[PDB]
Design a protein around this motif. Sequence first.
Motif, mmCIF file in Angstrom:
data_model
loop_
_atom_site.group_PDB
_atom_site.id
_atom_site.type_symbol
_atom_site.label_atom_id
_atom_site.label_comp_id
_atom_site.label_asym_id
_atom_site.label_seq_id
_atom_site.Cartn_x
_atom_site.Cartn_y
_atom_site.Cartn_z
ATOM 1 N N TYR A 96 0.841 -1.209 0.000
ATOM 2 C CA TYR A 96 0.000 0.000 0.000
ATOM 3 C C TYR A 96 0.876 1.258 0.000
ATOM 4 O O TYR A 96 0.664 2.166 -0.798
ATOM 5 N N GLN A 97 1.890 1.282 0.857
ATOM 6 C CA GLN A 97 2.753 2.445 0.996
ATOM 7 C C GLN A 97 3.512 2.702 -0.313
ATOM 8 O O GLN A 97 3.643 3.836 -0.754
ATOM 9 N N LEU A 98 3.956 1.632 -0.945
ATOM 10 C CA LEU A 98 4.593 1.719 -2.264
ATOM 11 C C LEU A 98 3.636 2.226 -3.344
ATOM 12 O O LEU A 98 4.018 3.068 -4.152
ATOM 13 N N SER A 99 2.398 1.747 -3.345
ATOM 14 C CA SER A 99 1.373 2.217 -4.306
ATOM 15 C C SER A 99 1.123 3.694 -4.144
ATOM 16 O O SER A 99 0.842 4.402 -5.113
ATOM 17 N N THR A 100 1.264 4.159 -2.910
ATOM 18 C CA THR A 100 1.142 5.563 -2.543
ATOM 19 C C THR A 100 2.255 6.426 -3.233
ATOM 20 O O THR A 100 1.961 7.473 -3.848
ATOM 21 N N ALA A 101 3.497 5.956 -3.148
ATOM 22 C CA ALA A 101 4.646 6.584 -3.820
ATOM 23 C C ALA A 101 4.467 6.559 -5.342
ATOM 24 O O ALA A 101 4.727 7.537 -6.036
ATOM 25 N N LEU A 102 4.026 5.421 -5.851
ATOM 26 C CA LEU A 102 3.899 5.222 -7.294
ATOM 27 C C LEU A 102 2.751 6.019 -7.894
ATOM 28 O O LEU A 102 2.897 6.559 -8.993
ATOM 29 N N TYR A 159 1.854 8.904 -6.694
ATOM 30 C CA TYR A 159 2.470 10.228 -6.725
ATOM 31 C C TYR A 159 3.370 10.406 -7.954
ATOM 32 O O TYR A 159 3.300 11.435 -8.629
ATOM 33 N N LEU A 160 4.207 9.421 -8.245
ATOM 34 C CA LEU A 160 5.096 9.526 -9.422
ATOM 35 C C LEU A 160 4.267 9.556 -10.695
ATOM 36 O O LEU A 160 4.518 10.366 -11.589
ATOM 37 N N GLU A 161 3.214 8.743 -10.732
ATOM 38 C CA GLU A 161 2.288 8.752 -11.853
ATOM 39 C C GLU A 161 1.647 10.112 -12.049
ATOM 40 O O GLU A 161 1.493 10.544 -13.192
ATOM 41 N N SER A 162 1.292 10.764 -10.934
ATOM 42 C CA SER A 162 0.670 12.114 -10.933
ATOM 43 C C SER A 162 1.586 13.195 -11.538
ATOM 44 O O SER A 162 1.113 14.213 -12.031
ATOM 45 N N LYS A 163 2.888 12.942 -11.478
ATOM 46 C CA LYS A 163 3.920 13.792 -12.046
ATOM 47 C C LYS A 163 4.431 13.294 -13.396
ATOM 48 O O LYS A 163 5.416 13.840 -13.919
ATOM 49 N N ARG A 164 3.757 12.283 -13.948
ATOM 50 C CA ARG A 164 4.088 11.666 -15.237
ATOM 51 C C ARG A 164 5.546 11.175 -15.277
ATOM 52 O O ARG A 164 6.231 11.324 -16.274
ATOM 53 N N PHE A 165 6.000 10.575 -14.170
ATOM 54 C CA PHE A 165 7.351 10.057 -14.082
ATOM 55 C C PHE A 165 7.317 8.529 -14.137
ATOM 56 O O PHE A 165 6.626 7.889 -13.348
ATOM 57 N N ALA A 208 2.283 2.053 -17.663
ATOM 58 C CA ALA A 208 1.666 0.722 -17.711
ATOM 59 C C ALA A 208 2.670 -0.397 -17.438
ATOM 60 O O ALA A 208 2.352 -1.375 -16.761
ATOM 61 N N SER A 209 3.879 -0.269 -17.974
ATOM 62 C CA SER A 209 4.940 -1.229 -17.689
ATOM 63 C C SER A 209 5.361 -1.123 -16.212
ATOM 64 O O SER A 209 5.670 -2.137 -15.607
ATOM 65 N N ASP A 210 5.309 0.083 -15.621
ATOM 66 C CA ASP A 210 5.576 0.266 -14.173
ATOM 67 C C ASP A 210 4.570 -0.531 -13.336
ATOM 68 O O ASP A 210 4.932 -1.156 -12.345
ATOM 69 N N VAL A 211 3.306 -0.510 -13.731
ATOM 70 C CA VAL A 211 2.284 -1.268 -13.003
ATOM 71 C C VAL A 211 2.574 -2.766 -13.039
ATOM 72 O O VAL A 211 2.447 -3.443 -12.026
ATOM 73 N N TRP A 212 3.021 -3.261 -14.195
ATOM 74 C CA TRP A 212 3.423 -4.655 -14.318
ATOM 75 C C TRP A 212 4.517 -4.969 -13.320
ATOM 76 O O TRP A 212 4.419 -5.929 -12.560
ATOM 77 N N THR A 256 -3.817 4.959 -8.928
ATOM 78 C CA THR A 256 -4.939 5.438 -8.112
ATOM 79 C C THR A 256 -5.912 4.314 -7.701
ATOM 80 O O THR A 256 -6.324 4.253 -6.528
ATOM 81 N N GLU A 257 -6.259 3.438 -8.644
ATOM 82 C CA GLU A 257 -7.106 2.258 -8.370
ATOM 83 C C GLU A 257 -6.356 1.250 -7.457
ATOM 84 O O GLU A 257 -6.942 0.730 -6.488
ATOM 85 N N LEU A 258 -5.078 0.990 -7.747
ATOM 86 C CA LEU A 258 -4.293 0.044 -6.957
ATOM 87 C C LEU A 258 -4.222 0.494 -5.507
ATOM 88 O O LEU A 258 -4.452 -0.290 -4.582
ATOM 89 N N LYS A 259 -3.970 1.786 -5.320
ATOM 90 C CA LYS A 259 -3.910 2.367 -3.996
ATOM 91 C C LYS A 259 -5.236 2.237 -3.248
ATOM 92 O O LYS A 259 -5.241 1.828 -2.085
ATOM 93 N N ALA A 260 -6.340 2.605 -3.901
ATOM 94 C CA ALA A 260 -7.675 2.463 -3.312
ATOM 95 C C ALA A 260 -7.956 1.030 -2.887
ATOM 96 O O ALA A 260 -8.421 0.779 -1.766
#
Length: 255
Positions: A115-121, A123-129, A171-175, A239-243
């Motif tokens: 969960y904590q990692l999904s939180t970081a990710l 955030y990175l997604e929100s910054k298009r990183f 998408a590859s990051d989610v994998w 966002t979905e993964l975190k939820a």
Amino acid sequence: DYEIQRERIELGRCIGEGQFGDVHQGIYMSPENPAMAVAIKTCKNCTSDSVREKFLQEALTMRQFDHPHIVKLIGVITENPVWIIMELCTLGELRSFLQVRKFSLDLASLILYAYQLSTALAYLESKRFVHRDIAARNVLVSATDCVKLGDFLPIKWMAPESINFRRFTSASDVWMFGVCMWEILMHGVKPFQGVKNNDVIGRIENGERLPMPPNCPPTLYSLMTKCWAYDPSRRPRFTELKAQLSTILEEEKLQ
């Protein structure tokens, strides 16, 4: 001014290995704080302009982010030997931590870390990183209830499109995050052990996936399997993964 004078840094014991060299703990005798505990990343062959540049680029990258589950940059020493000075996560690398505490760590703690990692990710997604190397080896443990993304070819973690066409996206990051979640639930065992890197893609194309870890809630494995959709456009976003991870964590904590 992120430049730190060498005399302000007391180099302590080696805590772990790193991509460019060993990582040490140490003390930063700073104006804000006369004895700040820090991590110090070293770089062998930093005499090479090419190696120095790649090494120091991670500090530039880290400086862009401010999130509770991403390690913070403290400073740099840019004369040879080049050091990156970082926040110290005192419990060290996630993989060794999970392996050593395999029978101390309850399921709620493992789910918290995902969960904590999904939180970081998110955030990175929100910054298009796009991170490109999400794996348990790049996560650090700051407390028993707090992990942080710690590091800015890993074939066994990579999405099919990354292996085939060297393509890296959100998408590859989610994998890769799917695989990292599997690692955590496996107490730090690597994916596809006993398999040669070259054979990995064949098995993915054949529709094979890492199996459900022992004691893993079915809701969680289902989320992992969605992360491993072959078609990148069918993978969830963070966002979905975190939820979903938040709901799963709560269920686990309630019973």
